[model samples]
Target: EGKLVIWINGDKGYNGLAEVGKKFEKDTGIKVTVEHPDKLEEKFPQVAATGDGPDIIFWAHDRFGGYAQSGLLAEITPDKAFQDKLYPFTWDAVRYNGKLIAYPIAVEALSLIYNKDLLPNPPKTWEEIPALDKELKAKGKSALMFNLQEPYFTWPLIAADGGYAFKYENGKYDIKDVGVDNAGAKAGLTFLVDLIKNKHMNADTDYSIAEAAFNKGETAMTINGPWAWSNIDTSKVNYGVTVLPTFKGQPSKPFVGVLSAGINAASPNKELAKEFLENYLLTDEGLEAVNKDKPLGAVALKSYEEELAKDPRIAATMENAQKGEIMPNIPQMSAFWYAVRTAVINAASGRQTVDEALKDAQTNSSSLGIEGRSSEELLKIALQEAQKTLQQAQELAKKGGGEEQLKRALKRADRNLWAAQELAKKGGGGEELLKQALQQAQQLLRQAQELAKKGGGEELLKQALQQAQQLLQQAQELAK
Candidate 1:
């Protein structure tokens, strides 16, 4: 009998995954245990870091970047045909450091929300807003409104002209390549300046004002996301949402957040988990069951288009999401928000020229700080990074016949490493435990080396072993 265990942070009443379990068990003869473990958010990272955890987990995509970088999540590669089955945005959030670390199931983004009666039809471009604003002014209506001061609400406008906080490429984010000061971003920022200058948008408008006005039916259109729907739905106005109008014939791409599922790299059952994810979970019926109870954003499958179109808001949001970039989920993104928000408020409010404002943003970005930490805490951080080495090394060890042999060596390595941690904590004899830890850790690398040369059995195995050894070596050096 085959089995797989998965944990979740999803909300639903109908037991969607449990329902999927029934069909999966019957069809594939594999038992799938689904659980909502208490405090999973706090526990998952701790457990996975130790080279142990569930076969799969359902969680927010933002957290995946750090987890994947630590080697707690497995790398999943699907066939191109299967990859094309999903909307491209579906893959955005789950990708980290150029690897497809997880598969996305749901998505949400910002779009243009309009009162149907006032507009009659959605505008196709931003140019139409000014033209339409003049006509609507006589009718006691404002053509457009949004929280211009907040970056989340205004970033779509910024990105419509190519502004970005970080340069993303080939599925990796180059945090060092800050793009907010570039010409494209300058143009985008100016658009916001012009919006207020021309009086189409209010400089002081924030989330509450936009929502209150839209709910009162005082505006023809507002830029908002699905989170505003419940309140807006109960409002008296007839409303419909659409992708944001083009910024001079260019797409206004907003940030789309995806909820995803990932396999643990330490999962002993990768083959089965991969089968369940690709063959069953990605199917039409599987996706339907996932969102059948409580819709988690919009389904990311194109096959759901017709069904989604029945709910225009969800359909438009999904369409907008597909055209947008995933919000970069790396830790460095904090600097992005801080820098861009400052530049936006300054530039948009007339306190600084757009050029001067963006230049300040570029200057504000700084490095990861280690200056304030004590030597003990700093050493501990290094050891934590090395934890990923063991998880991935365990993966390499288990792939061939020498798992038990490699495991024994690895356990000794991990034990001494933890022993070193204690030594560092006590503030003496630290250098003593490190040598012992280093020797034990290197034993793992050598054990794998000997096994692989038994006929040069596997190439990647040798590489994984060497990398693990090197990672530990650096950790030990940092300990001193």
Candidate 2:
């Protein structure tokens, strides 16, 4: 009878959500409302501050920190069962300041895309590039190509040389410890410049230029993400994708991007919103609709991700993502991008020496503040987060679902409660343990709800109830 509204960055996709909203209303008897505003990342906080924002928000994971730091996002800690169903890195992307603030939906990473007709096999290392470059030149094609306008395309080179944007320590991103200006960055920049100067690689190529060259078979390989696939004319060139090769002895770790769904802390209808997300929006049908609008990167769900990997195009992307690192989702990351991109351009174009450019870039990214919170407070939040998952599971179980589903949900709920109790008793605050418990509980609840729609066994339900009660009693005793 009530309404649950969501704010999605509509430009990404909307058709799937609209369809899912209708189905959610039919199942829950709650009206699902959706709104789209231009520039969600910029406008969300302003609107949310007025307490009139959507119950759930849809956007890239990178923006989650900005909303969360403002105290505008609800901490959504999913128990282990649920967490097991998604990619490990997906959780990392959604986690902020030691709390899971959102659910990751899709993931993206850069990989080496090569023209099969130009090179029968992809190079396994940077050492192979010179030979490949000469081979490609013999065939009237360039060895490699990529856009130079963005820092993202060149980040792998920096990473291979042991460069990083910020220091990740004890579950916190130390903003003051920018790593982009180190000796590693200089080595990386020098390598890139060497490629441009000796390998006959084009430093002036932007995204479109590089994409066009690759598709037209004027280039043997290109460093890009899945999004660039749309620019390729498969009819003309046979393409194969693989993880980026090593630089000397180091692996090239590109920046990974995750798309996720977040809940607004100020929303008037959180319970229903959480229920809707777990029970409805994450379903196979729901994901199909989402992909229909615009096929997202590899989905977060294990089943969906596996299915997507069957396609060679998606498989290559996912394979690379496994070795990639999620981009740091902090305000300080903004400075790093601007500074590093400028440094990259300057170093590549001979406008500044690599050392001078990196030094300047490092200076630009330095001097930011770092904050910390007490472990006890974090533990309490973990317990509360676990409790929320338990409550959500109980609500679904009350609806009297199918035997197998109810039993699984009960098992999930029991495990989570036990895990939480263990953390409270240990006094060490098992943040990771509790997080997994929360996710597992949510997973069970969603499964139980799905089976409820099918109708089945009461006998199995009774056994599940007995087990749940027994576990709850033990957990209470341990907590005291």
Candidate 3:
């Protein structure tokens, strides 16, 4: 008699969920309905804010952070046995602020898809790629083809030497700890530039050209994900899929993506949603039905993944996904994509040197605004305002126009300003820093009450009062 509504993004795995809904309804006796939504990313927040969105929402794990942070998604922690069933990397992908925010369903990562006839076997390491490139060139073929301009394809190489979008720490992404401008990134970029300069691969290749070349058997290998499977005409070339070769002893770790389903925090049927997710929807029976309609990459369950891996393609994708770093799901990732993509393009095209391009990219990424103010810049501004306010208060006191109460108020303001600077210096405009600063401002304002009780020095008190008020206001604004 009851119904569970699910809003699925119009993607391969989600569209196929329409069929899975029937199985869930039959097994659970709860009416299951699935809706495909356009612009669900934009609409989910708006709808959830009204406490009226779908019971469950299916989409990429990348957006989970935004929803979880907005308080629109419920926390559902599965049992250890259930959690252990997933590929370990998937757990991090589905988590936000150290809490499991979604049921991880499918994982996708890039692998080296090679033409077995041309190379016999894939290179075991990045260094061998150049030697193989020379061999292929002699036979009138290139070694590899990929969209060098896109970070999605290039990140594996960059990360092979230790580059990262942001540092992951204690189950959270430290957006302030960007790694793209470091020596490791420079090393990876240099390798890519050398490949372009030596004509080992085409620097200007885009998605269409790269895919076309690989499908037409013009290149020995291509770097791509399972989504491109439909495009490959397997009959034209006998191809093999494998995890990317190592780079200087480190694996050429690609960025991994997981598709997941998260329950709406505002859903009235919270218990029903959890029952549906853990007992039915994420169960083996449920996943089998979903996979039947559309191949959902390498799914999370161990037995199921083992079964899927019988197909070498799925095995290769799963292997690569395991080796890869989960793509950060935090909001700052939006800026990361733009900056890294531009850096890859510039370095690959020879428009800028590798190090120069990477440094510029880091600068651009850090400067990006969240809402409107960049976190780093906002902290700096807060510190400056605190100092400015204290200077004004001290000047008014030095003019000898205020009573002892006013001087005490000015002293409290100075102490508070010092505390603000210390908090700012501790780094990471994190919640702790903001709260401590706010508490200091509150104390300063309480001292200002002394100024309010006094007369004759009213004008001086008013001047000091305005500066303290402005500083407090700025701290509050920055806190949010």
Candidate 4:
């Protein structure tokens, strides 16, 4: 009696889902409803924060990681049998914290689409592209049209350099440890910077404009995804599609984007959502509508193999997919999203030196951990002052500052107390014993002053001072 609700984002996202929903409801008795906000990013965060949202929602691979860590996505770990039932890479794409967070419906990746008539064979690596571009430029033509505006295209450069967005450590994502500053990443950025610096690539317009230029024969080659080819009449240009180029050992591994559905944790009908994912959402008919309506790329199912193999362009896309880095769904990735893309664009444009740009990026990247601080020296001085103040306050307390004074003394005690607590927690018993001795030594520190206030004898002050000295020796021994 209940309807299963799914909130999709983006106009394109909604349309793809609506088409699939119709077939799903018809096939199964369960009603499937799809709703997408006009402005999805703004609305998605609000929905995510509420935790009382939809049964299933659309997921973006780039932003999925942060959501998964924050508990926005439900933790659903399927066994090996269920995992093995999925395609090799397809099953791996939606996993986070050992849970299958999303069900991939469609997948896509980038490739080098070139004009065979102008240049029969595509460059095997990034280096060959520029040299080929030079020959084209000499002939009053462009070698290829590259969109300098987006950093997503920078994946080919990283592939050429043997670098990636995130690396794994101890079987978990070690995003806190960045590789963008490494030699491989520099090599990748160098290729991009060289292209723009030498005027081999254009930056005036976006990919659509660049593709238009390619179709018009303004450029002989282009590195783009398969979706662009669907709009162009490839018959005229004699276009040839190939895998993204690589560096020497590293091959061009593009970012594979899977249009997937994640079950919303807030949904009461979670069982229905899972049923929809396994039986309806991932079904052949469900994916066919997605490809028919928006053939962004191919889905993970083996059923698409015939169609992909029959078409050379689709085949090239799948080849890149094989070498692709399936975009992760890590929750901490949002911190680097804009910063990484911006740093790439700036470095590639050669507006700023790659080192300077990357250094600035590392400084700004919020994901960094356990690096340098403002001033370690100043912190040490602060700790010393705090320790000295705590000792003096304890002396005043022992000289009859009483409970009120002890309470006040404890409040005044600074970084030393904090340090002592931390050290004790870690079994620094020797250090704690030293602190007690020091406190005992300070008992007669203000005794003379107190006696002076009461008009006491100079001899009494000497004895009080001597007792303080005895306590000091005991303190020093315990401290050592």
Stretches of candidate 2 off by over 4 Å are 1-60, 77-84, 87-89, 130-140, 197-204, 230-235, 264-276, 292-295, 309-315, 368-480
Q: Report the C-alpha lDDT of model 4 over 129-170, residue by residue, as the tens digit.
A: 778888988878888776666666776676456565567778
Model 4 residue 238 CA deviation in Å: 3.8
What TM-score would every model get versus the actual structure?
0.55, 0.64, 0.64, 0.66
Cα-based lDDT at residue 340, candidate 3? 79
Residue 212 of model 3: what lDDT? 89
Ranking by lDDT: 3, 1, 2, 4
Tens digit per residue, CA lDDT, model 2, 1-480: 289888886544566687889999898888987888754654565456446468889877876776787688988866777788787878888888878999888887888989887788898897688778887787777888898887889998888868888889997888778888777777877888888778567668788788888888898899986556654644488888887898868788888888888888987777888778876777677777776665676888877776677878787777777676788777555456657877888888888888888887777666401111343344444444444444444455566443465455555554555555455444432122233333444444445444444556343433333333333322221121
Clash pairs, candidate 4, are: 65-329, 65-330, 65-331, 66-330, 66-331, 160-247
Please write out the lDDT profile of model 3 over residues 282-377, one tens digit for every residue: 767777777765567788777777777788889888788879877878755645665777788888888888987888677655522353345445
Identify the runs in model 3 with alpha carbons over 4 angstroms from their true place. Answer: 1-11, 22-60, 77-89, 134-140, 168-173, 230-235, 264-280, 292-294, 309-315, 367-480
Each model's lDDT? 0.71, 0.69, 0.73, 0.61
The C-alpha local distance difference test score for the whole of candidate 2 amounts to: 0.69
* lDDT, candidate 3, at 114: 91
Query: Which residue pairs come into collision in candidate 1?
Result: none
Relative to the true structure, candidate 4 reaches a TM of: 0.66
Q: Is candidate 1 or candidate 2 better by lDDT?
A: 1
